[PDB]
Design a protein around this nucleic acid. Structure first.
Ligand SMILES: [Mg+2]
Ligand SMILES: [Mg+2]
Ligand SMILES: [Mg+2]
Lengths: 129, 184, 150, 87, 206, 81
RNA sequence: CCGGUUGGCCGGUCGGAUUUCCAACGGGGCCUUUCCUUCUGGCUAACCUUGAGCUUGGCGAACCAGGACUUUUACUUUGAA
């Protein structure tokens, strides 16, 4: 059964970006999905998305430009301290100049570089480049 | 006549719409002793971009049904006596704030007292003769949101002229930005 | 899904978007509420009450005409059952399978299906016990179950 | 890509597909670059005055080159009623 | 954009609906075809000939962009299009390949039939699949006289037409030749018709 | 196809789908008001009924249940409410 | 609204830095329905005050003290030992 709606969302976005499509429908649209998409959107990896309100959970239609190589999830949400962020970024980012590890810290959901600016850590959710 | 429908110390504006109520009540006895219980708390005037201000008439939540039974008639007569205005009856609903981690316990905060529920209730009661059939929320790339609501095509002649004023009153009450759409 | 089978069907009701319904319906809340408790007084479960309100009367679904649900209306008016409806139906299905098995011992399929039925009974009984609508020490056992059906 | 003081390095900034915004590699032998001639006020095409479209080998092998070229041409105004967004 | 003399004239529409160019395929429909306009109670679909006119004038714009007209190549291994591509090759600089496309004509640079075209136009993508398959090896754009059930992979401009009929294939090649000569300026009269009859591009039985 | 409007499907294509696989799910059933021969006695009946619905004035049974939509009896006059 | 760091600024000495300054990043105060608990005193913190612009007489953490009521964790930051 569905354990991770965020993982299903990111897998659907990956299949869409492999096929060359400019849009994808996400179901069922949690809060963490919205915040993850907002992080991807601020860096310019997706574009506009819209939240369809059916009354059950919501759906989302994201618009895709050509810039995304792979958005992924890290399951389980490992507990991450501040040196752990640099080992995680070295393991799963393609270069040291682009790409973001997204992690849910106690001051909201953010990427790893803004977490370094705020000096805060937390649990790891996924990655984007 | 005037002050009984009102609550506490009234303002001239409130008094004026109260006089509109009592000069409605003396005629047409098919609303007399039906709208005798009807009574509002206050009135807020907020300017739309068109020059013409709007009238939000805040009614108590039990009262709301009773207003809705006669609401078209009242908004017609009141807009027909208060020019340069559109007129709506909203219900004053209380928000209790979301309890923090350390904050000391109070009762369970039922779902009607949350900000999302009262905000889509005022969105519901902006447009009363029609029905919301859809709701969209656009997330633009600059970082700001736009909520779109979708109204059914029945009785849209009642509020097709008030829609940009509906937008301005929702922006004043919530800080959000809404757009309206009639699928056709 | 279909936890005790291999079926994967998707067939359910698709309730509408309007939570306030249906704008051809002129009746009041108290009339359908007295209709509900009249149907409950002659011994009908909430499913059958909702079916009768849907077809004969125009009642799209009782949560949107009135404020609350059919079982809440019955519980507040004092006609709530001692055990919930789905548990009761599973127990009476089990008692029919046991009576058949006493008659026809060589039905290995009935033995298998009985094991499935009693597994479903224990799953509901664990859930209802954990929300305290059944008292703890409520246990399904067959010789008690033949009489809890009445 | 550039060094610490301008001086662009990464020779051969490559082309990108007009449909999927994907890099056309140096050995993508299925990729094409369409040139459509421009017209000026007489019915006649001007030599050397083009509107240009690069299409990658990926969308061509999937068969969806023709719809992508329809949408790209209709967006640039050189078709009127061939492409529909509501599909 | 276009000066609106390029709209579908009633004369050209008469030619199109006379040749049965609108009569598309059977309820087989490759899903890459939004060109279909309605359907017939017969089970046969109708093609939107306005879209056929727009795709044809787009293909004419693409053909006219080529600097040396000998670099356009027209392919028809079907008998109904051989005379058509020979007449198109007469009226335009294009080299024809009528009949057999020998493989390795676009690859295999020591072959005697070695062409290096900048654009190739085929009659049926299914029957002329060898030409489009080699064109996908050497970066060559492909224009195809498509039907509603044709294999449109590696086709970039698909002109929808009834390619089961004798008159339709010839009319499409005729209209294509006429439009590229009009854009090239060999036919200065954009409004007046052509002295060449569309019956010149037709298949004859022996 | 690689570009399409998922937010605004055409009315035909939404009518082709299953009731749960549309954009927002909703019923394709409806209600009818049925009038029985003789006494006027308008009564509202669900389109897929599952019960032998009868008018309150007389046993003049209005619909019979089937696997799908209910079969309305022969002298009856319905309007789609 | 307000200050905090990195810039930035007449390159002021020919690689030193007086901030009226553009910018980025990171906090805090207040309002917007926003309880994110306060029973007793000294002391009054802001402070009513205020001298013609240093005056005599308003809200307790602003400074503590005294008791009283406390949903419970996991996680992460900082620090002690
Ligand atoms: Mg504490
Ligand atoms: Mg199982
Ligand atoms: Mg399933």
């Amino acid at each position: 059964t569905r354990s991770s709606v965020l993982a299903d969302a990111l897998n659907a976005i990956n299949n869409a970006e492999k096929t060359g499509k400019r849009q994808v429908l996400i179901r069922p649209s949690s809060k963490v999905i919205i915040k993850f998409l907002q992080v991807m959107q601020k860096h310019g990896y997706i574009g506009e998305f819209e939240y369809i309100d059916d009354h059950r959970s919501g759906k989302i239609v994201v618009q895709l430009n050509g810039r995304l190589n792979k958005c992924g999830v890290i399951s389980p949400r490992f507990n991450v301290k501040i040196g752990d962020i640099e080992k995680w970024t070295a393991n799963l980012l393609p270069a040291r100049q682009f790409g973001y590890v997204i992690l849910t810290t106690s001051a909201g959901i953010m990427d790893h570089e803004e977490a370094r600016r705020k000096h805060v850590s937390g649990k790891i959710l996924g990655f984007v480049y | 006549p005037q002050a009984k429908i009102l609550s506490q110390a009234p303002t001239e504006l409130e008094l004026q719409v109260a006089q509109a109520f009592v000069e409605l009540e003396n005629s047409s006895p098919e609303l007399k002793a039906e709208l005798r219980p009807l009574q509002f708390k206050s009135i807020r005037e907020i300017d739309v971009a068109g020059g013409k201000k709007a009238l939000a008439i805040f009614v108590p939540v039990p009262s709301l049904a009773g207003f809705h039974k006669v609401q078209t008639k009242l908004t017609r007569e009141l807009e027909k006596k208060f020019q340069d205005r559109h007129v709506i009856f909203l219900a004053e609903r209380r928000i209790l704030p979301k309890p923090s981690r350390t904050s000391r316990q109070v009762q369970k905060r039922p779902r009607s007292r949350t900000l999302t529920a009262v905000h889509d209730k005022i969105l519901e009661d902006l447009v009363f003769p029609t029905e919301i059939v859809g709701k969209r929320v656009r997330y633009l790339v600059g970082g700001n949101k736009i909520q779109k609501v979708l109204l059914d095509s029945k009785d849209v002649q009642q509020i097709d002229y008030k829609l940009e004023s509906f937008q301005a009153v929702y922006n004043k009450l919530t800080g959000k930005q809404i757009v309206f759409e009639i699928p056709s | 899904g279909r936890m005790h089978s291999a079926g994967k069907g998707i067939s359910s009701s698709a309730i509408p978007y309007s939570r306030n319904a249906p704008a051809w319906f002129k009746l009041s809340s108290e009339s359908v509420i007295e209709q509900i408790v009249k149907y409950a007084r002659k011994g009908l479960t909430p499913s059958q009450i909702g079916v009768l309100l849907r077809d004969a009367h125009g009642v799209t679904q009782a949560r949107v005409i009135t404020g609350n649900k059919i079982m809440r209306i019955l519980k507040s008016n004092g006609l709530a059952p001692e055990i919930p409806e789905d548990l009761y139906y599973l127990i009476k299905k089990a008692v029919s399978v046991r009576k058949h098995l006493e008659r026809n011992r060589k039905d290995k399929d009935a033995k298998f299906r009985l094991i499935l039925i009693e597994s479903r009974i224990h799953r509901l009984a664990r859930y209802y016990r954990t929300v305290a609508v059944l008292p703890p020490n409520w246990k399904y056992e067959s010789a008690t179950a033949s009489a809890l059906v009445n | 890509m550039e060094n610490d003081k301008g001086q662009l390095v990464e020779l051969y900034v490559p082309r990108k597909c007009s449909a999927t915004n994907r890099i056309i590699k140096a050995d993508d032998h299925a990729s094409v670059q369409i040139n459509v001639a421009k017209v000026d006020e007489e019915g006649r095409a001007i030599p050397g005055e083009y509107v240009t479209y690069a299409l990658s080998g990926y969308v061509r092998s999937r068969g969806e080159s023709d719809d992508s070229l329809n949408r790209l041409a209709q967006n640039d105004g050189l078709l009127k009623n061939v492409w529909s967004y509501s599909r | 954009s276009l000066p609106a003399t390029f709209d579908l004239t009633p004369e050209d529409a008469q030619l199109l609906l006379a040749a049965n160019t609108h009569l598309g395929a059977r309820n087989v429909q490759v899903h890459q075809e939004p060109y279909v306009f309605n359907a017939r109670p017969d089970g046969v679909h109708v093609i939107n000939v306005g879209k056929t006119w727009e795709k044809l004038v787009l293909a004419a714009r693409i053909i006219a962009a080529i600097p040396n007209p000998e670099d356009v190549v027209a392919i028809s291994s079907r008998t109904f299009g051989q005379r058509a591509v020979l007449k198109f090759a007469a009226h335009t600089g294009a080299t024809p390949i009528a009949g057999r496309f020998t493989p390795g004509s676009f690859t295999n640079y020591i072959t005697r039939s070695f062409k290096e075209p900048r654009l190739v136009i085929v009659t049926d993508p299914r029957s002329d699949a060898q030409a489009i398959k080699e064109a996908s090896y050497v970066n060559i754009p492909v224009i195809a006289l498509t039907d509603l059930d044709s294999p449109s992979e590696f086709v970039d401009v698909a002109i929808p037409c009834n390619n089961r009929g004798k008159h339709s294939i010839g009319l499409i090649w005729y209209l294509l030749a006429r439009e590229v000569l009009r854009l090239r300026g060999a036919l200065v009269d954009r409004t007046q018709p052509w002295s060449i009859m569309p019956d010149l591009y037709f298949y004859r039985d022996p | 196809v690689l570009v399409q409007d998922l937010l605004h499907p055409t009315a035909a294509s939404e009518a082709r789908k299953h009731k749960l696989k549309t954009l927002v799910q909703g019923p394709r059933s409806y209600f009818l008001d049925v009038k029985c021969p003789g006494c006027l006695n308008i009564t509202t009946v669900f389109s897929h009924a599952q019960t032998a619905v009868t008018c309150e004035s007389c046993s003049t049974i209005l619909c019979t249940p089937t696997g799908g939509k209910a079969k309305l009896s022969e002298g009856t006059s319905f309007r789609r409410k």
